[PDB]
Amino acid sequence: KLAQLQVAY
Amino acid sequence: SGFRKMAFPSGKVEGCMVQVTCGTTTLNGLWLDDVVYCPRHVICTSEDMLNPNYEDLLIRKSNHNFLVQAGNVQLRVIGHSMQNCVLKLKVDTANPKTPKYKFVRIQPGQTFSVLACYNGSPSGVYQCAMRPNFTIKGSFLNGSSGSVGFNIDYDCVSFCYMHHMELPTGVHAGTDLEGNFYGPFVDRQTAQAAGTDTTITVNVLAWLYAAVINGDRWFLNFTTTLNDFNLVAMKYNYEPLTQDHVDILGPLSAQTGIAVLDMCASLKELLQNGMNGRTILGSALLEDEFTPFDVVRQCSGVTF
Amino acid sequence: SGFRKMAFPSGKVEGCMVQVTCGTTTLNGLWLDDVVYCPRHVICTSEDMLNPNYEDLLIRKSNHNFLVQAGNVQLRVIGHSMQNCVLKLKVDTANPKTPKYKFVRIQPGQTFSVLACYNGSPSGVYQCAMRPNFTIKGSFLNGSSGSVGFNIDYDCVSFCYMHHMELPTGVHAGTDLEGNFYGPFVDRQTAQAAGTDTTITVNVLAWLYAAVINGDRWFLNRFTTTLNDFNLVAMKYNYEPLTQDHVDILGPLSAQTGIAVLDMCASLKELLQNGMNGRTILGSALLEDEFTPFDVVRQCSGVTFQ
């Protein structure tokens, strides 16, 4: 549903 | 003999991948000479992602906040700026494995190899196309941000893609290496939609020529005009074929002695009457992620 | 998310590829430490190939009958030996780009990356399965011999394949890096033929699981089958028999999705008996069998709740 900016944590 | 979806050899690009970290936020960067390029959303926390003020968030950062690792080795950041949706982090060491390279903005329907990276470490490599709707159909998990798409043009690495985001439909969006987005997409975690997709007609024609080069002839037959072909092409949601498309399918046409318009007639029938439990080059669909030069590289055994 | 045929990064292997020339034959070698490994058919003339006595042919050769090039630099050959069907060329310099590596033998149904090479230089990298009949469906042209198949685990390269030849049906045959052929093949010029191929069932099921994780459900049904009832359909359509080891290795994908393995088996039976009817699965109109369960989890990276 929402765009994901594909950083890790 | 045989035909595979073939990626470029990746070793030149593997020596350039590094891990960029801001606080707890981590992604990948591209170490070329004494600059590390990476997506700007490395400066975001999970709660900044809705509509970040990049300009403000950066003013708040110092060189010492950006932790850069190339394998085990630590790289001192000595300078920082933002160009569109990329950070450029000046570091104190030039990458001694910088290949000859350029930055190119590629056209929809062009292919490239993706080196998927996690924690600054290459994990996988696969061939991709810039779809007409400016998205790619990738395989990317969280942490893949900063992974790059590239071509090898003779002796020179052509960087054409840095990975930023996954859209809701599961397709992928990113920038050229000058931080500009392919398509109308922004680096915000918002409800963004892809536009109407289309089959890359010139690629499908290039693949049928590969099938003929490899001794597959069953779909050759009738001869059509350019305008009659395109009436059919767009009912099937194919890109209209231009006279420049016909021009660049010239080498393949000459080599096979099949006139481009005779191959358009072949395609027209396949679109209308289907593949009827047949296959072409191991596939029971019409493949659109082989460009003309892609077919020549694999079929003639071009090395780098 | 998304799902692609994904090769391992080829860098660690590229740094080991050399060109070996003996007489009028050129192919690829693999340069690890002070040895170059290549197919031993490099020492043979056309006449020799018809009935090669490799022991007798190799003792007749001098170190200088072998021209080894690492890009622009000739490697000096200081010794030659033979292990099964691979030629080990001892060279005066150790490859300073030799990665951490092991030689492994893979089983039918397992996958690896191929770095297709000519004149010691890389053309490209793709993913393959060892077929049940011990052939690979590669993309290989004249001069590809010595090209290797590999998997990468952390920093360690597992070399599992060296390319030797092409069979009449256009499929490919080769050895491990200890030089034993996969399958009943010999490196002499006699009539040889691939056996009956079968589809790798466990891999097609691994692939159906990947389709569901990536959003696809059209091909699911409320039915289920016994291992025995499925294998009667498996045989009809020339699939490998499914075994409890296969059902065990799918268990993690089964858990992640909540689709029991004999349920997915019921999906595959209907898919075999009806076809897809103009519909696609993960961008393919065929049932895909060159993704192992391992390969699905590498890209799907699911959690298993306990």
Residue numbers in the entry:
A (entry chain E): 226 to 234
B (entry chain B): 1 to 221, 223 to 305
C (entry chain A): 1 to 306
Q: Could you pull the original sentences from the published paper?
A:
In addition to its essential role in viral polyprotein processing, the SARS-CoV-2 3C-like protease (3CLpro) can cleave human immune signaling proteins, like NF-κB Essential Modulator (NEMO) and deregulate the host immune response. Functionally, 3CLpro recognizes a hydrophobic substrate residue at P2 (usually Phe or Leu), a Gln at P1, and Ser, Val, Asn, or Ala residues at P1’. NEMO is necessary for activating NF-κB during the canonical NF-κB response signaling pathway, which is a critical first response to viral infection.
